[PDB]
């Protein structure tokens, strides 16, 4: 019967993909990189300490002006900070105090948040009556909303725990495109610089590359052994890095459809909560569960420095657009700025 | 002091915001937070109505004490990805139906509901985030259990049962079997109540359990516990 053939066709296609990927590799990145100068010892000092949150900080996001922050904690308040002067611009109470993610629009007019309430709330920062209101509430996910990223002032992509990413339209509050294919809960989400593709990490130890305007998965990336919790594009948009719970960061190339380099150490036995890059892409910053953040040489696979100073688990990382500073937020209700 | 008028006004705004957050912080720091769990629909609706699309919160006050009860039903997701948000809860309320040992898991055949409830209790009580969080266990529908035990022996659910086929010993055996799953007996307690009561006794039981938990926490703070 043809049922056996239709069952084995998936395995045959997987084997063909694996063989094509293996035949496409000739020289590792370490072999090409061992003949370039090391970065050195990168030392950063805490320059600002933003205080005012009273519970675990779960997410942060930088503004496009590299000055305004947004932070979310379990108290149920979103705080917009002025990083230069350590000042609070706004304090927005939330209907649901269980928030996991926050976002800052590129135009700076909107802030989004969501969590266990299955709802992404959009907040209008610039109102004529002088207070931050709710533009609308986006409903339609059957699981907790884990990540949200703004594409423009009218579109926002949301990552949820229902094994599905969705693209929304804030003018009508509807779901323009639905992305399916993941098996487990989808945890992280990062957008391409040109805002045409985005990668998505899930709990099935896999990452996928999507097309925004077509709703079609293009590539799938394997290699991890546990849940992926963070993901971030390279500045040129041709690579991305993933952090998982097996105490290891990977680097993947979209054009080669392969893993280039792994980042791990024997002393590291704790999971990874956040992954971020530098402006040039040479330095990769990873927040860990053992109370500190490590700085990695993205080309030499070497530890360039350690960002210690947090008394609890580092849960969120962020690098400014101009690359001037990096902001770490932990579960000790503190935000630190580094240079 | 090297500051403009607008900068000083922004500083004053920041100070007012700090004051508002401080007020909200000590407003919310005196509210008891409880987390409610239960396998399927065991006693969730009964325990909610006795106190009259994702997480559901319920507000009620009892003897100058406000309560925050969170329900995590219909959250078909991995528990380990959001269970660390409830580290600071005062107590965990667990609802188990007594009249389900004769029932099948409906969605899955050849499976007992009591065993699923026991596995959920074992997962919750032995978690890394709830080492020192006390558990209030509610056993619902004792009348249905009492009127159903006269024809269906408990041996089908528990083959090792060697007791009388009546209400008191069977209920004691079930309570003991739920309590034996606690592997952290030196750091937390389990409060068990039979909660098929028309009168307003479940709220009182919750109040006494929370008072005991608060006394133990205060004694740990002062070094006497």
């Amino acid at each position: 019967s043809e049922l056996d053939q239709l069952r084995q066709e998936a395995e045959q296609l997987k084997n063909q993909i694996r063989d094509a990927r293996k035949a496409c590799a000739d020289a590792t990145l370490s072999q090409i990189t061992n003949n370039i100068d090391p970065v050195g010892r990168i030392q950063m000092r805490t320059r600002r300490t933003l205080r005012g949150h009273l519970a675990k900080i779960y997410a942060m996001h930088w503004g496009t002006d590299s000055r305004l922050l947004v932070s979310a904690s379990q108290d149920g308040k979103l705080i917009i900070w002025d990083s230069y002067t350590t000042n609070k611009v706004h304090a927005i109470p939330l209907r649901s105090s269980w928030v996991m993610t926050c976002a800052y629009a590129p135009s700076g007019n909107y802030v989004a948040c969501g969590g266990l309430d299955n709802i992404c709330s959009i907040y209008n920062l610039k109102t004529r009556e002088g207070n931050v209101r709710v533009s609308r509430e986006l409903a339609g996910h059957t699981g907790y909303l884990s990540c949200c990223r703004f594409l423009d002032d009218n579109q926002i992509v949301t990552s949820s725990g229902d094994t599905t990413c969705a693209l929304w339209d804030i003018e009508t509050g509807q779901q323009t495109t639905t992305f399916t294919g993941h098996t487990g809960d989808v945890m992280s989400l990062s957008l391409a610089p040109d805002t045409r593709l985005f990668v998505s990490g899930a709990c099935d130890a896999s990452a996928k590359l999507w097309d925004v305007r077509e709703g079609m998965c293009r590539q799938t990336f394997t290699g991890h052994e546990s849940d992926i919790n963070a993901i971030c594009f390279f500045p040129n948009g041709n690579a991305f890095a993933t952090g998982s719970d097996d105490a290891t960061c990977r680097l993947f190339d979209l054009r080669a459809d392969q893993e280039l380099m792994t980042y791990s150490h024997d002393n590291i036995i704790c999971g990874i909560t956040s992954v971020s890059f530098s402006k040039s892409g040479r330095l990769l910053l990873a927040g860990y569960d053992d109370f500190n953040c490590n700085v990695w040489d993205a080309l030499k696979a070497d530890r360039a420095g350690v960002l210690a100073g947090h008394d609890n688990r580092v849960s969120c990382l962020g690098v400014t657009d101009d690359g001037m500073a990096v902001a770490t937020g932990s579960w000790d209700s503190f935000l630190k700025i580094w240079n | 002091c090297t500051l403009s008028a607008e900068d000083k006004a922004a500083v004053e705004r920041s100070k007012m915001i700090d004051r508002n957050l401080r007020e909200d912080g000590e407003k919310a720091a005196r509210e008891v937070k409880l987390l409610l769990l239960g396998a399927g629909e065991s006693g969730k609706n009964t325990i909610v109505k006795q106190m009259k699309t994702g997480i559901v919160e319920t507000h009620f006050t009892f003897k100058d004490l406000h309560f925050k009860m969170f329900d995590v039903g219909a959250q078909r997701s991995e528990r380990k990805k959001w269970i660390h948000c409830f580290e600071g809860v005062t107590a965990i309320i667990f609802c188990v139906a007594l009249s389900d040992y004769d029932l099948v898991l409906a969605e899955d055949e050849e499976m007992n509901r009591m065993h699923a409830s026991m596995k959920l209790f074992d997962s919750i009580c032995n978690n890394k985030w709830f080492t020192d969080t006390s558990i209030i266990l509610f056993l619902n529908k004792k009348d249905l259990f009492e009127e159903k035990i006269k024809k269906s022996p408990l041996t089908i659910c528990y083959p090792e049962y060697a007791g009388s086929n009546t209400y008191e010993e069977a209920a004691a055996y079930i309570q003991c079997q739920f309590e034996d799953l606690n592997k952290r007996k030196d750091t937390k307690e389990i409060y068990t109540h039979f909660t098929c009561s028309t009168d307003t006794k479940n709220v009182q039981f919750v109040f006494d359990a929370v008072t005991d938990v608060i006394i133990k926490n205060n004694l740990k703070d002062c070094g006497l516990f």
Partner: single-chain antibody
Amino acid sequence: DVQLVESGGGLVQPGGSRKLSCSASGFAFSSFGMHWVRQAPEKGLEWVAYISSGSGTIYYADTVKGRFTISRDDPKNTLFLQMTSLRSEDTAMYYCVRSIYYYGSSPFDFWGQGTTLTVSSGSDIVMTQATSSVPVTPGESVSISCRSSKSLLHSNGNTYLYWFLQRPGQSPQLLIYRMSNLASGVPDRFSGSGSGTAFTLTISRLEAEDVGVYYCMQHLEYPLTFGAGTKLEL
């Protein structure tokens, strides 16, 4: 529907007392600082008093200290001004100005209708507009220049200079709030430029809707000082 209605005017004998009331309806009154500005019939704008959010900072002009009192009632959304020892120089039309201060804010954004009050019988920054009346034809550009005795460029890179337009028989409105930034609703044809002590407002493709008087105000240090005013005609 932002509104600021002032009442309590009329004719007052010299040496008397009068309370001015400013009622707000359409915005969060508690989060905005409030200003009082009066305009004498000599066609000039003069700053009077300021009260902050939370009533933690109150400022007065040198000509009203010890005899004018400003207070706000945030439950009732009403702003008060208690005026004592009235002189003949206090005969003016008083405006209620709304201001908010954070990073990237737009203070002096809304002005009230105004009330008319009639009385019978050194270190301050000086800002001067040389042109007091210039003719203009619709469909042509125009530039208005304002200068200051002290440089308004602070160490933080902000140049605190504001531009206002008052049409005949109307209330002033904000055009540029820090030397380059257009306010909400202002057409793009208005531009701000300058640095230090020289400033210029450019109005390309002027229409009959832009005919009025233009003012330059500094917000570097209290008291806030306006200009004489450049009047556009024809």
